[PDB]
UniProtKB/Swiss-Prot annotation:
Effect of residue 80 to G/K/N/V: Reduces resistance to ampicillin about 30-fold in DH10B E.coli strain
Keyword Hydrolase attached: yes
GO biological process, alphabetically ordered: beta-lactam antibiotic catabolic process; response to antibiotic
Residues reported to bind a beta-lactam: 48, 105, 141
Protein name (Swiss-Prot/TrEMBL): Beta-lactamase SHV-1
UniProt organism field: Klebsiella pneumoniae
Keyword Signal found: yes
Enzyme class: hydrolase
Length: 265
């Protein structure tokens, strides 16, 4: 592979789209590699990690329980509800909903959860409360994936998303149990995790959440590292490309490969 920057440049050129990236030390927060780190990209399903961060903060405060059962109706369901559609009769626990949202990208699950944190506005308020003054949610699923050109709604920046993921995962903000739970849900991703794990060299930790939207919008937030250890946060977003899903996937993979091959910093 080319050097990480060379590769990212190549991906923009080949995709005719905009790429945003940050690679960050998890322990210290040190920014190692960056590209358009301050430019805005649609979060898409990557927001479900921050969502469940907010849910866990409520659990920590005693205003919520992961065991609480939520009951809903079929009329409440939105496009793509692989787990939630199976539980119209019995319902789902808050914890099960976070599992479905993060591990299966279940969209109705995400909406049921978003309600409990005060909706898009409530989640945005949460972000500002932990010192993210950039990331904002404005829509529910599935409108949050529209990726309208120039639209600031429903967006993050690579730098802000990496900072916020670090804040949720390693700072005093969530309880130890909540920090471990948010990570495990990412470890347990069924959508892209097993695929990624299958092509990573032996010895590499991966945990992740992916997203996809309109106009070529694609992304991943990931924890990655050698010697079986979650060493770095990696955030990669693409927007405004006409390319196939396969090629968008391949380009993000190539960027990952460049990072892994040229890891020592």
């Amino acid at each position: 592979s080319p050097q990480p920057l060379e590769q990212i440049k190549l991906s923009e050129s080949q995709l005719s789209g905009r790429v945003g990236m940050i690679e960050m030390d998890l322990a210290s927060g040190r920014t190692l590699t960056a590209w358009r780190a301050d430019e805005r990209f649609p979060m898409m399903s990557t927001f479900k990690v921050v969502l469940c961060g907010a849910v866990l903060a409520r659990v920590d405060a005693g205003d919520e329980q992961l065991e609480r059962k939520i009951h809903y109706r079929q009329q409440d369901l939105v496009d793509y509800s692989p787990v939630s559609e199976k539980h119209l009769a019995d319902g789902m626990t808050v914890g099960e909903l976070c599992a479905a949202a993060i591990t299966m990208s279940d969209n109705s699950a995400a909406n049921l959860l978003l309600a409990t944190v005060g909706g898009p506005a409530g989640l945005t308020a949460f972000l500002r409360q932990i010192g993210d003054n950039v990331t904002r949610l404005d829509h529910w699923e599935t409108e949050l994936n529209e990726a309208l050109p120039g639209d600031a709604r429903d967006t993050t920046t690579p730098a802000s998303m990496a900072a916020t993921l670090r804040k949720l995962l390693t700072s005093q903000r969530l309880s130890a149990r909540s920090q471990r739970q948010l990570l495990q849900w990412m470890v347990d991703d069924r959508v892209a995790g097993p695929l990624i794990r299958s092509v990573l060299p032996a010895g590499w930790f991966i945990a992740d959440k992916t997203g996809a939207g309109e106009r070529g919008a694609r992304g991943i937030v990931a924890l990655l590292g050698p010697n079986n250890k979650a060493e770095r946060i990696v955030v990669i977003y693409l927007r405004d490309t006409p390319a196939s899903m396969a090629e968008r996937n391949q380009q993000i993979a190539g960027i990952g490969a460049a990072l892994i091959e040229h890891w020592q910093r």
